[PDB]
Amino acid sequence: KNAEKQAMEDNKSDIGWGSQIRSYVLDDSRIKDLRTGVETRNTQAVLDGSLDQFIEASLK
RNA sequence: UGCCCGGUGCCGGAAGGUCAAGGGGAGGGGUGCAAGCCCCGAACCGAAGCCCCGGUGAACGGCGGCCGUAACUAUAACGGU
Ligand SMILES: [Mg+2]
Numbered sequence: 160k161n162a163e164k165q166a167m168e169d170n171k172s173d174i175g176w177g178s179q180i181r182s183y184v185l186d187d188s189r190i191k192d193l194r195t196g197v198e199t200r201n202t203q204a205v206l207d208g209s210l211d212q213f214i215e216a217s218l219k
Numbered sequence: 220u221g222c223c224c225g226g227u228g229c230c231g232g233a234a235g236g237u238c239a240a241g242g243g244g245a246g247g248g249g250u251g252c253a254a255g256c257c258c259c260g261a262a263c264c265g266a267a268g269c270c271c272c273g274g275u276g277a278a279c280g281g282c283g284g285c286c287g288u289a290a291c292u293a294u295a296a297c298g299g300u
Pocket residue numbers: 203
């Protein structure tokens with residue numbers, strides 16, 4: 160079980176520079192999902208929970 | 220060649236507590252007609268030892284447990300008890 164866990168951990172990104180999926184450039188009000196990829200402009204509405212947008216389009 | 224002198228040992232301590240014989244003799248008893256004779260007997264004085272106060276490990280010896288915590292993981296330098 161631990162062996163399968165370490166397989167996950169070492170295959171689990173790094174939370175680092177250039178390892179990412181979103182911009183919250185709140186200095187020009189975008190939140191971009193670089194993967195499908197959409198561009199909502201109503202930023203502090205995403206933090207409210209409008210994730211449906213990205214999710215529904217990211218399930219392709 | 221570390222840390223622990225609380226227990227044991229040894230060392231030191233004219234205080235204090237306890238402490239035997241002995242000293243003392245408040246008081247009581249037996250007997251005698253009596254002087255007397257004889258027997259218990261409190262306070263208090265009275266050593267070492269022990270208690271008590273310290274020291275001492277190349278003296279006898281003894282040198283822990285639980286819980287949480289770091290780059291998604293393991294561990295825990297760190298903390299709590
Ligand atoms: Mg607001």
